[PDB]
């Protein structure tokens, strides 16, 4: 038989959430956490939580080339109105993917699972879109699929190298400039002319240890 006062809003504290270092704006917010009781661990009720904001907005690219690319954060550690927020994942907006994908083209999907230098084992989904040649009288441009298989073989070959090049930090940096997309592009076009390529989704789920010392490197 609990029964709390009312206006529990006037019982939920205040807190600042910090984004990551190598983005741009290391404030992404302030938000309203439960007041620390000795019958509630508000710090634990800040930690498990995972957020997504598109990197474009945080990066504050005014005309956003980055508009689609969705980015996940996880609120690692609580210290005096500051919450750190490491890399958790990167998805993609449904808007971009769906609009590009208009009949008349072979579609490719590739898979990699590979391990970073720290024990995050992350799975990247490379998604290939295919391009009609200039003055292609052929309205539909279809791959022979020796092509598609070979592109898939190249897609996985390129992404595996890239993952193991230093931790999530260096991995996400490759995502940011999209050097992966360019390396895909030079290699794929030898096989077959290709349009739009992105790293589409990445899920980390193995996350090694809390490893707070190396974690605090991220903390500016």
């Amino acid at each position: 038989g609990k029964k709390k006062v009312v206006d529990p809003f006037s019982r939920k504290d205040w807190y600042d959430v910090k984004a990551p270092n190598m983005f741009q704006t290391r404030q992404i917010g302030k938000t309203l956490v439960n007041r620390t009781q000795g019958q509630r661990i508000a710090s634990d009720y800040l930690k498990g939580r995972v957020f997504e904001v598109s990197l474009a907005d945080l990066q504050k690219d005014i005309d956003p080339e980055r508009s689609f690319r969705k980015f996940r954060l996880i609120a690692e550690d609580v210290q005096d109105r500051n919450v750190l927020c490491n890399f958790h994942g990167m998805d993609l907006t449904t808007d971009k993917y769906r609009s590009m994908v208009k009949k008349w083209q072979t579609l490719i999907e590739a898979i990699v699972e590979a391990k970073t230098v720290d024990g995050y084992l992350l799975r990247v989904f490379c998604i290939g879109f295919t391009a009609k040649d200039q003055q292609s009288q052929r309205k539909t441009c279809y791959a022979q699929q020796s092509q598609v298989r070979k592109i898939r073989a190249r897609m996985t070959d390129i992404i595996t190298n890239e993952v193991s090049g230093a931790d999530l930090k260096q991995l996400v940096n490759k995502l940011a400039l999209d050097s992966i997309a360019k390396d895909i592009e030079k290699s794929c076009q030898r096989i077959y002319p290709l349009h739009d390529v992105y790293i589409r989704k990445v899920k980390v789920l193995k996350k090694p240890r809390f490893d707070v010392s190396k974690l605090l490197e991220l903390h500016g």
Binding site: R26, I28, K30, N34, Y45, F51, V53, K70
Partner: protein
């Protein structure tokens, strides 16, 4: 590695789930799970068919925005969510009206995201094959 200065523009996450038959504007912790003031369009109007209405949704968004603003969430990033699924997948009519009403309460906006989780492939949508006539 550009430090942090105190003092606003300090964002939260709006989490709008705007479905047909009811629209929710659930403003939460930026990290997600710890909330302030869920306040649906439902308690804004008692018609049962108008719970989804953009009239209801506007009022809900306005009510929530006061609770957020007084306690020191100046601003919010926004996640919009269909029903996404073997469900309609179309955003509910109160969705746009919630979105614009949250902004027009001096709440600063930076993100409009469509989180709507899209099936790569999923079983049987309701109505079993001689499908939902009328």
């Amino acid at each position: 590695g550009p430090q942090v200065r105190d003092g606003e523009i300090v964002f939260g996450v709006a989490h709008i789930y705007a479905s047909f038959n009811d629209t929710f504007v659930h403003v939460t912790d930026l990290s997600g799970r710890e909330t302030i003031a869920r306040v649906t369009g439902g308690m804004k109007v008692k018609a049962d068919r108008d719970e989804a209405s953009p009239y209801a949704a506007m009022l809900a968004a306005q009510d929530v925005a006061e609770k957020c603003k007084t306690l020191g969430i100046t601003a919010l990033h926004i996640k919009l969510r269909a029903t996404g699924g073997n469900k309609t997948k179309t955003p509910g009519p109160g969705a746009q009206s919630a979105l614009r009403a949250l902004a027009r309460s001096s709440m600063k906006i930076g993100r409009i995201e469509d989180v709507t989780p899209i099936p790569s492939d999923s079983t049987r949508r309701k109505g079993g094959r001689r499908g939902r006539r009328l």
